[model samples]
Target: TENILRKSDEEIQKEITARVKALESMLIEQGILTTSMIDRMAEIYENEVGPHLGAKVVVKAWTDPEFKKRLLADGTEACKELGIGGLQGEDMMWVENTDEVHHVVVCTLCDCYPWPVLGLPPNWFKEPQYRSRVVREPRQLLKEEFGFEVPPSKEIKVWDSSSEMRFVVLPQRPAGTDGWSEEELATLVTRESMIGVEPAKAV
Candidate 1:
């Protein structure tokens, strides 16, 4: 869905304009596109979309010891138990991030994002420059683009998407969530946390 190399600023600006026009025309033609609906959609990020399903996955894992072990061993099959489908043919791996080890995903090539879990890749992610530089030099690239920089010592590993296998990061559970029900904790799982970018803070 994107180019392998970086694009000029003009190209990006042009794409932005095109998308804006498309949205405007859509709204003009379709009475269904309302301001509130658009705003609400903005709030529903892809990483968080399948999470109602994830909540069930977590709760099931919490109550069933055997399921927990299975999930840790084979995340693809594990997620299926919660009724998450459309990923059978894909090679999806669930990386569990702890206090020490963190997981971040980037497609060094074109956008190889997990659309099944997350939605369409963010616009910036599809940028030729962002994708091109993120893997080769994530530490410098992220800081320049989003004021985010991974410490070189962290040993960041870039994942190239060639196979059908996709990835999702299971973040460390929040500290005070020990006794909380699965529903209670599900609200706390934000996409940024899963990507090692930030934790879910109270809104």
Candidate 2:
């Protein structure tokens, strides 16, 4: 039992990947799906549905006060208003980082992330280390692993995402960006920032 529970993370990941590939091959053999279709779907998720969409939402919130209010009120609806919603995003919630409080998200049970805007969760996001440790010591994890430091005065809040409700961090907008276009400002938003592991890039 101890050995079973002690499998390395990489070993466990490899086993799961093999199992998934076996299932996919079975489906293909049954003519239920094709390799090309799988490839295309992967391509769409990789290139089309990703952090850029999240950045767009962040930029909109930064530039438009009303939209920001709506986002704070209802993240899922606000994302839909901007045409940015799909699977795993139906009940998205945006947690805002403020002067006195910082927010970060984690899915302790599984990798229940906001996939539509953020794309697939990064490998680190799904790992046991991040999922477990972030909840226990978010400030230390952010600082040591991600090289992001939240001031000692601010409180760190960890949001645990579930299948019914996922979360995205609305990072505090960097200053000195006044008069910048939405497109220009969007570039400042990074996936790490949206995950609350780091702040948006400096202007």
User: Best candidate per lDDT, number?
Assistant: 2
Candidate 1 residue 93 Cα shift, in angstroms, is: 0.4
Please list the residue runs of candidate 1 whose C-alpha ends up more than 4 Å from where it truly belongs after superposition.
1-66, 87-89, 139-153, 200-203
**What's each prediction's TM-score?**
0.61, 0.88
lDDT of 2: 0.91
List, residue by residue over 1-203, the lDDT tens digit for candidate 1: 46679788899999999999898878867886777877776666534454455445555665567987787788778877766645322455766655455566666666666554555566766668666775677667656765655566665555565567776666566666667776677787655544444444343
Judge candidate 2 at residue 155 and give its lDDT: 98
Colliding residue pairs in candidate 2:
none
Q: By how many angstroms RMSD does model 1 differ from the true structure?
A: 7.5
Model 1, residue 188: what's the lDDT?
A: 76
Candidate 1: C-alpha lDDT: 0.62
Q: Residue 143 of model 2: what lDDT?
A: 93
